[PDB]
Design an enzyme around this catalytic site. Structure first.
Site, PDB file in Angstrom:
ATOM      1  N   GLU A  35      52.640  56.616  24.162  1.00  0.00           N
ATOM      2  CA  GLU A  35      53.028  57.228  25.433  1.00  0.00           C
ATOM      3  C   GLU A  35      54.300  58.056  25.286  1.00  0.00           C
ATOM      4  O   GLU A  35      54.410  59.138  25.866  1.00  0.00           O
ATOM      5  CB  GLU A  35      53.220  56.160  26.513  1.00  0.00           C
ATOM      6  N   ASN A  46      52.641  65.933  35.408  1.00  0.00           N
ATOM      7  CA  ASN A  46      51.195  65.904  35.591  1.00  0.00           C
ATOM      8  C   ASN A  46      50.741  67.063  36.466  1.00  0.00           C
ATOM      9  O   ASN A  46      51.537  67.701  37.157  1.00  0.00           O
ATOM     10  CB  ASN A  46      50.759  64.575  36.207  1.00  0.00           C
ATOM     11  N   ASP A  48      49.056  67.152  39.214  1.00  0.00           N
ATOM     12  CA  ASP A  48      49.262  66.972  40.649  1.00  0.00           C
ATOM     13  C   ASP A  48      50.723  67.073  41.068  1.00  0.00           C
ATOM     14  O   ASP A  48      51.020  66.873  42.250  1.00  0.00           O
ATOM     15  CB  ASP A  48      48.686  65.626  41.124  1.00  0.00           C
ATOM     16  N   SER A  50      53.206  65.078  40.068  1.00  0.00           N
ATOM     17  CA  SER A  50      53.976  63.892  39.746  1.00  0.00           C
ATOM     18  C   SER A  50      54.486  63.985  38.310  1.00  0.00           C
ATOM     19  O   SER A  50      54.098  64.867  37.537  1.00  0.00           O
ATOM     20  CB  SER A  50      53.133  62.636  39.929  1.00  0.00           C
ATOM     21  N   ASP A  52      55.751  61.489  34.747  1.00  0.00           N
ATOM     22  CA  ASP A  52      55.763  60.215  34.028  1.00  0.00           C
ATOM     23  C   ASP A  52      57.108  60.022  33.331  1.00  0.00           C
ATOM     24  O   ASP A  52      57.614  60.940  32.686  1.00  0.00           O
ATOM     25  CB  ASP A  52      54.656  60.152  32.967  1.00  0.00           C
ATOM     26  N   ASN A  59      54.430  56.496  36.293  1.00  0.00           N
ATOM     27  CA  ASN A  59      54.133  57.683  37.092  1.00  0.00           C
ATOM     28  C   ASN A  59      54.788  57.642  38.475  1.00  0.00           C
ATOM     29  O   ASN A  59      54.697  56.642  39.200  1.00  0.00           O
ATOM     30  CB  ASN A  59      52.613  57.824  37.244  1.00  0.00           C
ATOM     31  N   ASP A 101      48.075  44.756  38.846  1.00  0.00           N
ATOM     32  CA  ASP A 101      47.480  45.297  40.059  1.00  0.00           C
ATOM     33  C   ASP A 101      45.956  45.377  40.002  1.00  0.00           C
ATOM     34  O   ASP A 101      45.348  45.982  40.890  1.00  0.00           O
ATOM     35  CB  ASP A 101      48.093  46.671  40.376  1.00  0.00           C
TER      36      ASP A 101
END
Ligand SMILES: [Cl-]
Ligand SMILES: [Cl-]
Ligand code: NA
Length: 129
Positions: A35, A46, A48, A50, A52, A59, A101
């Site tokens: 990563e 990203n 959209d 956003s 990271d 994110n 989650d």
């Protein structure tokens, strides 16, 4: 800070990640390698809008606040910049929430594509833990 492989394994182990929700330590080290290349200051934007952040590329759409992802949540209740510190505590604590989650480590695309189903124990071979 750019961690060494065993240095990061030991830091993650101290912070409770070995076998957390059943993921052995090698999984977390492998994910961090692909990563961020073990760099706590890694950022990536990203499509959209956003971003990271950090060693585990957490994110801003869901997990931290960076003041520039409209309509996002802050589920770890943390400024995203806190995830860039040389102290990995914030990143580890937030990662524990993410992996809990329901989707496990599949939340990390690089883990799914590059670590899942591989010999992840190799990532901690030779380390003093
Ligand atoms: Cl392992
Ligand atoms: Cl799971
Ligand atoms: Na956010």
């Amino acid at each position: 800070k750019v961690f060494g492989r065993c240095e990061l394994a030991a830091a993650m182990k101290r912070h409770g990640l070995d076998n957390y929700r059943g993921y052995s330590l090698g999984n977390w080290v492998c994910a961090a390698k692909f990563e961020s290349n073990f760099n706590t200051q890694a950022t990536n934007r990203n499509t959209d809008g956003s971003t990271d952040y950090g060693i585990l590329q957490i994110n801003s759409r869901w997990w931290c606040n960076d003041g520039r992802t409209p309509g996002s949540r802050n589920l770890c209740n943390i400024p995203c910049s806190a995830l860039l510190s040389s102290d990995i505590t914030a990143s580890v604590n937030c990662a524990k929430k993410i992996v809990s989650d329901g989707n496990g480590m599949n939340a990390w695309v690089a883990w799914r594509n590059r670590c899942k189903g591989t010999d992840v124990q190799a990532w901690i071979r030779g380390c003093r833990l």
